[PDB]
Design a protein around this ligand. Structure first.
Ligand code: VIZ
Ligand code: VIZ
Ligand code: ZN
Ligand code: ZN
Lengths: 338, 338
């Protein structure tokens, strides 16, 4: 798993204990925790494998952040706040909701000012209700001057060197994440390189390499939950998803000051620790390096995932209806390739 | 089936009787036999449905053909002669034999002069052996002057009008077919429009429309038997090919002077009648009409077959190995589209 819980400086006790981790059916092994000066960390990022960097100082000015400080300085912009009846915040593409009419969302999005989100959070704690909120908002110009000064204080020297040494594309987005304890972002994979900068609280990160595509059963590309696993990690249906019994993850717990490299196309299941308070995270997303001119074989697992995605996209446009993608694929292989 | 056997002119008896037809497990209904002046025959060809035209005079000068006449006038060119231990002449692409090493051919091709094929045929009848031969050769310049005169005597006025009225491409090939009684060309589909001009003997033609792709289970596109059905019509494996229990064919018996329009992508199973002597056929293959600019929906069945073919071709080149096409397709749909 995450190994033994780390001891905090000043003898302040264990940062967490195992009772704050949710229980699942699959084994894991630890993601390495290394210094940014460690060459092994450099070779992991280069080979697109996850690593937790403990001393980047990437978001050092943001480590003082909390709700009180942010509400006063984050400005009067709008923030996307997702609500959920349960602890699972399954994301859904609103653009693709037209393809699947028999899909009703379980986590409705709502725009609100930051002071409204802080107010709405404190009502749930007062009322003792079980409703959960998760702020997920991209940062921009509307933020106040002090947040701008903190942002400029980020270790741009280090992360821009990482961008150059890997040949990545440009920085596409900065996502601010503020979640309640026990909030779970279920397993999914992204298409860009991610630097996961933990700020407040602790998050358990369970990653799965791209070659376990067969064990995680993502939704159809045209489904609103595209790129997310169909498997309910809390109650896996081994009849529908038999190879989930073969899944093995990479696990770590990140805390304030840690940066987790989530490589492009790697599955990740992220949860804020139980009874751990609020969590704050800022992501750095970079387009991957361009596909090289001389195609080398055998193909990497994420390249085959890209191929499978393009086949499904091409079929949807070719047939004139994404719902015919399924039956044509079955017609193509039944009694011919299985 | 083929309906009642036709009575020949001059009270020469029935052209054939049902005992000369092989028995299969599927029902059929008759392909229409019409005059070329019948508008219904014109609308069948236009809508790409099979029809037997009884009075085209397409190969009228060739109706006098037999082994003796051809051997004397066909010239000293080489002829492709396929041999088979059984009555099934399953064709195999020699170019694709590299992809599947565990494939050994059952019908070896051999080049020989026409007088050698006639000699080799008469030895089998003398020795009483059960070996079977099937001459399948494209016609060209090397043929003698009298065969040239017969060829020029074909009803080019009619068939070139059909080429124009359908917007077909150019005439790509003329295949001369000389087979022994009981010879079976198992079920397969071609990609071009075919005018099937019967000359000597009788052939039972069983056709299946493109929308029965699911019932006929063709080989993988990269397999040497690409475009041929995997189902043994003589012993169908309902466990591997369950939807073959749903197959329904279009059936007719063509004789001297009949022309069968086999539409592009239609499956066809062709057999020379049992105890019917030798059969002679000449095919006319035309590239189909170009795909129209404004794509209309829903797609025709043969267009979806074209899509499935291109997906398999694209995967073979993308993965660098046609043998990885299967497992990737299974990975793509297992637990996601089935
Ligand atoms: O709670 C947690 O900490 C876990 C968690 C909460 S959100 C989340 N990821 C996303 O939101 C990203 S994505 O899924 O929309 C897909 C995507 C991928 C690259 C992009 C790059 C730029 C802009 C947008 C992008 C979007 N993770 O991993
Ligand atoms: O015994 C019988 O009468 C039944 C029978 C014996 S042969 C046969 N068909 C073929 O040979 C053709 S094909 O399979 O190679 C595929 C193809 C398709 C279009 C073409 C056009 C031009 C040149 C070559 C072509 C090749 N049929 O239907
Ligand atoms: Zn993500
Ligand atoms: Zn054919």
């Amino acid at each position: 798993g995450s190994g033994e819980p780390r001891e905090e400086a000043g003898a302040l006790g264990p940062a967490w204990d195992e009772s704050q981790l949710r229980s699942y059916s699959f084994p894991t092994r630890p993601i390495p925790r290394l210094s940014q000066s460690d060459p092994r960390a450099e070779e992991l990022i280069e080979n697109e494998e996850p690593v937790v960097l403990t001393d980047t100082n990437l978001v050092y000015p943001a480590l003082k952040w909390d709700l009180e400080y942010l509400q006063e300085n984050i400005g009067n912009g709008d923030f996307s706040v997702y609500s959920a009846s349960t602890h699972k915040f399954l994301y859904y593409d609103e653009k693709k909701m037209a393809n699947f009419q028999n899909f009703k969302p379980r986590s409705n999005r709502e725009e609100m000012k930051f002071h409204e989100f802080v107010e709405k959070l404190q009502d749930i704690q007062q009322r003792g209700g079980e409703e959960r909120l998760y702020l997920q908002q991209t940062l921009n110009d509307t933020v106040g001057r002090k947040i701008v000064m903190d942002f400029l204080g980020f270790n741009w020297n280090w992360i821009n060197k990482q961008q150059g040494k890997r040949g990545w594309g440009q920085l596409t987005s900065n996502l601010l994440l503020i979640g309640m304890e026990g909030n779970v972002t279920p397993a999914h994979y992204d298409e860009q390189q991610n630097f996961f900068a933990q700020i407040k609280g602790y998050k358990r990160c369970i990653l799965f390499p791209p070659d376990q595509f067969e064990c995680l059963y993502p939704y159809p590309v045209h489904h609103p939950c595209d790129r997310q696993s169909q498997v309910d990690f809390d109650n896996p249906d081994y009849e529908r998803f038999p190879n989930f019994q073969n899944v093995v993850g990479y696990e770590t717990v990140v805390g304030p000051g840690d940066v987790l490299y989530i490589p492009m196309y790697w599955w990740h299941h992220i949860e804020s620790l139980l009874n751990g308070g609020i969590t704050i995270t800022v992501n750095f997303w970079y387009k991957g390096a361009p596909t090289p001119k001389r195609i080398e074989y055998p193909l990497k697992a994420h390249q085959k995932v890209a191929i499978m995605r393009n086949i499904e996209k091409m079929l949807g446009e070719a047939l004139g209806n994404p719902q015919e993608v399924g039956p044509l694929l079955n017609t193509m292989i039944k009694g011919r390739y299985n």
